């Protein structure tokens, strides 16, 4: 069953959960751009479900080709990058279906990526999602939260400007 | 007052007028033919090296109506490696020059290794068997011409890199001389006796006669009616003294014909176990320190032949345009090894080659993948430098033709996934023979006089498409795999 | 009265007019897009197969001032292999055809094989476990469209190559039909039986409700009201047709797109070991004979690559100009496996690669190497061809776009150290099919009222360079062994 | 549902899907040959212009999966003034579809003065005797055919400018209809009685059996099983009304083929006296409002001849990075007259020419000189248009595809002295058409529903280099008296 035609129970800058999962240290990212803080910060994800969403109401700068990644600008003049997994190029595309359009305006909880992640956890080298903060240099706070997230629900950052 | 610097590249001769904290007041570049005699092969006639680095002596003072009386002294910086013979009565070579590049005397390379005079060369001279150095091509010269190993002993005939030849050219026959750095290269010279080898003159049959005078590249070495020579280093060791690097894990990285990247390693000779050199550079007053090497071949060159003889550019600087129109190269690898490969990997017997190929493959896909080639490049001998040095770089400081180009920057940070920090005053080869002219003549005194100068006009941070970094650099560790071994013997 | 050809390429459409014994009286020649979703992929859209061809049609006529009324019959030649499956209602494909070339549907060969079903796929279809045939093809459309294998049997949608996708709509909708050679191509199709094999049918779960009535290549079909549809043939079948080959041993090779060399072999399948394909071709009424084939995928869509993407030459026609301006290509090797290999190496997984480039290799070193290329396939599949048939060939009869070029066709005679007859009708693919629709409509009879045309303009002979040609094909065989199986799996 | 528009230019076929509040869902473009006969001659078959438009039809739809049922009306822009003469029964042209730009009858033209017709075809069309118009071209092929004008009255064959052959395509025959805005153009039809002026009929020997229906420009006209055909426009016309202009004093220029600059002068006709046409474009409704015109032939055109003709550029996008390469064209002008000037000047005897060249002038000098003969022409009408209609435009609204070129907006900018605001939809001449569309079906019930979609995406101001526009406009005004009267008569 699928339940996406179907009403939800809707209810100083946060950075929603672009997908479910726990909240992972961007320091146990056992890649070094990420566990270094060189392409931004902000945290990580162990993926548990199939989509990945909008997670702030802004536009999408633009998503990789081979589907797995994602950039999103804020109208708070953030710059988030979503990620899926660590060396995910290497797939060529299996294990997504692109959803939304390369700069379209999206409100939070938006789908923007589908995955399939049965295939990835066995296919890619992690699954773990950096959702990290690009334009740093600009924001003067950055708050990071803990434990489960839900998709397009829970927050994970909290930045001030 | 001011100093002038002549710097004599693979390519071209650029001679610059520098006014007392380096302000260039003047500059003068003037091309010159690159002969290819056999395909794997490299030449330059040493007459047209001369004929333009003389000319653009008399070129850069005439801009700015000077001459003599207002220059305290000249510094000289050089490609390093090919080898010129010489007559020292007449000053004629009895051949041309063999480039760095040049590949003919991989047969004798290959015989010095069959006897097990690897281990010896290594550990004395800090390098590798291979055809770049001048070692091997001077035995190929006097092995060739008629005369030469009796006119040797007799005295007649005079051996020389660019330096010594170009010194030999400005005082008339005079003096006679070479650097540390310079003959540091030749692959005659022990790195820790500091004097010529002579295991090594004895295998290569060398008559010790033909040699220079190998002597400081901060020093007084004769006067010319150009008015003293003081500085003397190869062109890269002197873009690493124009760099200020000059101390203990202090590195940069040139890109002119080809990449050549160093670490100043204090006054400590390290043994290379990934692929690099030990050589000699300069300290912060031009004494002998030591440095580890990693030299590719083709960077800048490569770009050079797509303009040239390949004509899909016009302007070397057209590449950028053309590069950043398609994202991506579409699969496609160029593997620059026009001259073999050296770089971490040696084999003399490598050529060029473009890889996977597609029919929807267009001249944009080739000129990106071979601006990238110089940043695969350039990792393969950073992690080199890294895992020899035990030293992780947070920020690659670069020079050189090739940095003004910001696509291949950038995507240099981020198949790197460091910080490229690019200076204003890019060439910096002709500072650091300027700085070591100025300092033998008194008009610096040193260094610190000249530490303002380093002004990052730019710094380059990998963006998110570092991401990918490994996988696009595991394509090119494929494709280098394939170019490989090419030639036969 | 005139016989019309419809001749549609990979390219291409042609049509052209024809009087009683073969004048071209007229033609038209309609390019069309080639599209690349992935680099491994081609594609081309039926609706633009169909709207180039159509208007073809009445462009020739037109042009001469002809309708109907005169035209005896329409015979038809297609590029073999690419599948499309269409709605049968509406008129409409479910997807874009597959084009030969295309690489996608080599994940599900690799299962084909690891099964064990390559003794049954040569041994009853002649063919060879490749992307190449339609057979897998269908299968990727089906597993990727929704609707797919319920309307399938329900027969809302309707298979075919190219041949069966253009009289269903000249006839309508009305017949839907298929000859011997295309089909022998599809790898669903024995050849000995005569009919769809259904062991693969079921292997690649094909309904066989889909699939065209297979026809003889010399029959009326149907009728259009363009007016009867009597010859039809693969474009290579009917150009050994059109060479009046049809006998045992006869050969020719076609330079178009790729280079197809086939033998006829009687009213015998022999059995290939050395890398060849056993399939149909017509006899001289238009019965199954049978024939051996050695396609190589890239030739004239080489020098077509050299003019659109990578913008080297402007026309076709000028690579023989610049070719000959350096009498070789200085060690360079174009290796042209831009979708896959095939040939007689088969392996879909090598792209394309040039080889051996050094400094001074200049533009013209890799035009004048990608002809030489084209020369050097064609010599890989006649030893295969001569090994099997156990035939030495003592003259190659050739035709093509690309036999126009007095270059490629004395490099070739070199290389093979044979002679090679050019003819002056050229492009004989449409003769073929001409001649089989002329026989079934009586406006002909036979093959002899037709031998007086094959007049031979030119015969190239071995001049005394044919000396090195195993130290240039040595070349290439290395050449190849190193684009090889570049794409991973 | 959605609007579709079907946009048929001198070089391309475009139709485009439109959802409710103007979105572009998909699009197709399909370019056809541009034929030479004779130098100064232009020609199109009108088969291609049928054979693209119909299968761009096809595209977009099937793009979007969609057909009829969601469809509202359809639309049609088309290049104005290129006759057409067909048969009525078959559907084939007695000859191609002779363009707008074509030059062969100004032979026609020149009797047409020695007589004294010109105050009469001024005062009751609007127009200037000129090659041009569809008038005289329709003379010429009735006078060239042999059957013509007497298969004429028996009324066999039609006359059709594009909007008119298009629908009798669509609609199998059924209907033949003009609208005023494209009628207005033929120098057949009387702008004031808004019906077909028949002292010109008599003058040009042209039966009134051949003529359409002249309608308006929104109204139902016919339906095609493609469903109804409800708007009509030439293309320029249809621009006018896609940018809203509709009330007195409002204007654009577009940059297409040719530039067009129109000013919608309300319900009044004005009478140049500056080298401008008086036209017929709609008001708010569809109705027949009147416009100022000055029309260039040359204009985006002119990138492609460098691009296609001359090789200078592949793309038509890289003529802005070449030009932007040099700051001046060093004294060179490239005056576009390819087919005759027309613009203020009319003379269809100037061709083409490149002035005031010198030693050290290189290709982008040319490049940069073409883009800018672009604005110098837009110049010549803009200033006629305001000393025609007495207001000084304080802003150019701009469309076309040219417009994307940053250097030659801002150019523009600086030669004209006034603002240039570009829209972000870009190519408004398949909105003008679908807009005319909307409102006779309902989709719309009017224009001010449709304000907001006119969003100026960048407005270019004269920066400090519009100081020297005077010198560099009265160099062109030089060039082109000296590219005037070429061809000899």
């Given at each position: 069953?699928?339940?996406?035609?179907?009403?939800?129970?809707?209810?100083?800058?946060?950075?929603?959960?672009?997908?479910?999962?726990?909240?992972?240290?961007?320091?146990?990212?056992?890649?070094?751009?990420?566990?270094?803080?060189?392409?931004?910060?902000?945290?990580?994800?162990?993926?548990?479900?199939?989509?990945?969403?909008?997670?702030?109401?802004?536009?999408?700068?633009?998503?990789?080709?081979?589907?797995?990644?994602?950039?999103?600008?804020?109208?708070?003049?953030?710059?988030?990058?979503?990620?899926?997994?660590?060396?995910?190029?290497?797939?060529?595309?299996?294990?997504?279906?692109?959803?939304?359009?390369?700069?379209?305006?999206?409100?939070?909880?938006?789908?923007?990526?589908?995955?399939?992640?049965?295939?990835?956890?066995?296919?890619?080298?992690?699954?773990?999602?950096?959702?990290?903060?690009?334009?740093?240099?600009?924001?003067?706070?950055?708050?990071?939260?803990?434990?489960?997230?839900?998709?397009?629900?829970?927050?994970?950052?909290?930045?001030?400007? | 007052?001011?100093?002038?610097?002549?710097?004599?590249?693979?390519?071209?001769?650029?001679?610059?007028?520098?006014?007392?904290?380096?302000?260039?007041?003047?500059?003068?570049?003037?091309?010159?033919?690159?002969?290819?005699?056999?395909?794997?092969?490299?030449?330059?006639?040493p007459?047209?090296?001369?004929?333009?680095?003389?000319?653009?002596?008399?070129?850069?003072?005439?801009?700015?109506?000077?001459?003599?009386?207002?220059?305290?002294?000249?510094?000289?910086?050089?490609?390093?490696?090919?080898t010129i013979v010489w007559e020292k009565?007449?000053?004629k070579p009895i051949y041309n020059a063999i480039?760095?590049?040049?590949?003919?005397?991989?047969?004798?390379?290959?015989?010095?290794?069959?006897?097990?005079?690897?281990?010896?060369?290594?550990?004395?001279?800090?390098?590798?068997?291979?055809?770049?150095?001048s070692?091997?091509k001077v035995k190929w010269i006097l092995?060739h011409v008629?005369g030469s190993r009796?006119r040797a002993?007799?005295?007649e005939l005079l051996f020389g890199?660019?330096?010594?030849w170009?010194?030999?050219?400005?005082?008339?026959?005079?003096?006679?001389?070479?650097?540390?750095?310079?003959?540091?290269?030749?692959?005659?010279?022990?790195?820790?006796?500091?004097?010529?080898?002579?295991?090594?003159?004895?295998?290569?049959?060398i008559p010790?006669?033909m040699?220079?005078?190998?002597?400081?590249?901060?020093?007084?070495?004769?006067?010319?009616?150009?008015?003293?020579?003081?500085?003397?280093?190869?062109?890269?060791?002197?873009?690493?003294?124009?760099?200020?690097?000059?101390?203990?894990?202090?590195?940069?990285?040139?890109?002119?014909?080809?990449?050549?990247?160093?670490?100043?390693?204090?006054?400590?000779?390290?043994?290379?176990?990934?692929?690099?050199?030990?050589?000699?550079?300069?300290?912060?007053?031009?004494?002998?320190?030591?440095?580890?090497?990693?030299?590719?071949?083709?960077?800048?060159?490569?770009?050079?032949?797509?303009?040239?003889?390949?004509?899909?550019?016009?302007?070397?600087?057209?590449?950028?345009?053309?590069?950043?129109?398609?994202?991506?190269?579409?699969?496609?690898?160029?593997?620059?090894?026009?001259?073999?490969?050296?770089?971490?990997?040696?084999?003399?017997?490598?050529?060029?080659?473009?890889?996977?190929?597609?029919?929807?493959?267009?001249?944009?896909?080739?000129?990106?993948?071979?601006?990238?080639?110089?940043?695969?490049?350039?990792?393969?001998?950073?992690?080199?430098?890294?895992?020899?040095?035990?030293?992780?770089?947070?920020?690659?400081?670069?020079?050189?033709?090739?940095?003004?180009?910001?696509?291949?920057?950038?995507?240099?940070?981020?198949?790197?996934?460091?910080?490229?920090?690019?200076?204003?005053?890019?060439?910096?080869?002709?500072?650091?023979?300027?700085?070591?002219?100025?300092?033998?003549?008194?008009?610096?005194?040193?260094?610190?006089?000249?530490?303002?100068?380093?002004?990052?006009?730019?710094?380059?941070?990998?963006?998110?498409?570092?991401?990918?970094?490994?996988?696009?650099?595991?394509?090119?560790?494929?494709?280098?795999?394939?170019?490989?071994?090419?030639?036969?013997?």
């Amino acid at each position: 069953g699928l339940f996406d035609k179907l009403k939800s129970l809707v209810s100083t800058i946060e950075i929603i959960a672009p997908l479910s999962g726990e909240i992972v240290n961007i320091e146990d990212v056992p890649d070094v751009v990420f566990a270094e803080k060189i392409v931004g910060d902000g945290i990580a994800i162990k993926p548990t479900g199939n989509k990945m969403v909008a997670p702030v109401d802004g536009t999408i700068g633009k998503i990789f080709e081979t589907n797995h990644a994602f950039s999103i600008e804020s109208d708070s003049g953030v710059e988030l990058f979503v990620h899926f997994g660590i060396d995910t190029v290497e797939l060529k595309g299996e294990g997504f279906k692109r959803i939304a359009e390369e700069g379209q305006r999206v409100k939070v909880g938006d789908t923007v990526i589908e995955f399939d992640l049965p295939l990835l956890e066995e296919k890619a080298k992690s699954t773990l999602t950096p959702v990290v903060i690009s334009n740093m240099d600009e924001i003067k706070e950055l708050i990071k939260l803990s434990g489960s997230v839900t998709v397009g629900e829970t927050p994970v950052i909290r930045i001030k400007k | 007052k001011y100093i002038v610097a002549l710097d004599q590249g693979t390519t071209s001769s650029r001679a610059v007028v520098m006014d007392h904290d380096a302000n260039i007041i003047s500059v003068s570049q003037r091309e010159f033919e690159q002969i290819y005699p056999k395909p794997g092969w490299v030449e330059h006639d040493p007459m047209e090296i001369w004929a333009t680095q003389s000319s653009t002596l008399v070129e850069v003072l005439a801009k700015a109506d000077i001459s003599s009386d207002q220059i305290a002294a000249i510094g000289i910086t050089n490609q390093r490696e090919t080898t010129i013979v010489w007559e020292k009565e007449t000053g004629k070579p009895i051949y041309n020059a063999i480039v760095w590049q040049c590949r003919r005397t991989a047969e004798i390379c290959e015989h010095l290794k069959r006897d097990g005079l690897e281990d010896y060369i290594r550990s004395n001279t800090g390098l590798v068997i291979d055809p770049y150095f001048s070692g091997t091509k001077v035995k190929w010269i006097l092995d060739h011409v008629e005369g030469s190993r009796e006119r040797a002993r007799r005295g007649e005939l005079l051996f020389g890199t660019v330096d010594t030849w170009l010194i030999w050219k400005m005082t008339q026959g005079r003096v006679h001389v070479t650097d540390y750095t310079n003959a540091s290269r030749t692959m005659l010279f022990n790195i820790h006796t500091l004097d010529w080898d002579d295991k090594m003159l004895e295998v290569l049959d060398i008559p010790r006669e033909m040699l220079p005078e190998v002597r400081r590249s901060s020093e007084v070495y004769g006067q010319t009616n150009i008015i003293p020579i003081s500085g003397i280093a190869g062109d890269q060791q002197a873009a690493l003294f124009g760099q200020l690097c000059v101390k203990e894990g202090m590195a940069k990285n040139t890109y002119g014909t080809g990449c050549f990247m160093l670490m100043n390693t204090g006054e400590k000779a390290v043994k290379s176990e990934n692929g690099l050199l030990t050589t000699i550079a300069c300290g912060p007053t031009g004494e002998v320190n030591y440095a580890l090497e990693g030299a590719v071949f083709m960077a800048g060159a490569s770009i050079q032949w797509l303009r040239d003889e390949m004509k899909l550019i016009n302007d070397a600087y057209d590449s950028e345009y053309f590069a950043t129109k398609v994202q991506n190269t579409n699969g496609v690898y160029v593997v620059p090894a026009f001259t073999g490969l050296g770089a971490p990997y040696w084999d003399p017997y490598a050529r060029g080659a473009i890889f996977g190929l597609t029919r929807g493959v267009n001249a944009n896909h080739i000129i990106r993948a071979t601006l990238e080639s110089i940043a695969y490049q350039t990792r393969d001998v950073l992690e080199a430098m890294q895992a020899d040095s035990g030293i992780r770089l947070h920020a690659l400081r670069v020079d050189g033709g090739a940095v003004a180009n910001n696509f291949l920057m950038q995507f240099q940070s981020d198949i790197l996934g460091t910080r490229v920090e690019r200076p204003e005053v890019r060439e910096v080869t002709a500072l650091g023979a300027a700085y070591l002219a100025g300092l033998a003549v008194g008009f610096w005194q040193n260094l610190d006089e000249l530490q303002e100068k380093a002004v990052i006009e730019r710094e380059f941070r990998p963006g998110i498409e570092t991401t990918e970094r490994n996988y696009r650099y595991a394509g090119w560790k494929k494709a280098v795999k394939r170019a490989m071994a090419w030639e036969e013997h």
